Amino acid sequence: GAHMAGGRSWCLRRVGMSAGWLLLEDGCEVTVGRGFGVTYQLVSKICPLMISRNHCVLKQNPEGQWTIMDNKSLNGVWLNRARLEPLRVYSIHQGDYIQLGVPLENKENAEYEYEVTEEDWETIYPCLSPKN
């Protein structure tokens, strides 16, 4: 057998932080936004209204591959810098970077940037955002 604690999972690792990571739980749909219906509610003090109420959706496709989709967000989703077309489904891979929204004036990076990565559960769990 095998302990759950020794497991692995895909996740969105919050760049620059050991907090705010988002779990991509096998077999689940993961929605992200600032509204109250979503799996992970983002709350920004820096710029409350950058992120859309329902900003993006992550889910495995019929082949079992994780994907992301921009849910008609106002300020966009970027996969390695390329702006995603709203509602088109894009496969996401180890090492990909996802940006939600855009950098503010005189800022190098958007607040919400993630690396798509498969990591040990022991690494991920202390860093996860609470579920909404």
Binding site: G35, C47, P48, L49, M50, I51, S52, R53, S73, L74, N75, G101, V102, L104
Partner: peptide, 7 residues
Amino acid sequence: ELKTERY
């Protein structure tokens, strides 16, 4: 709710 703002 407040609508999202464009940046």
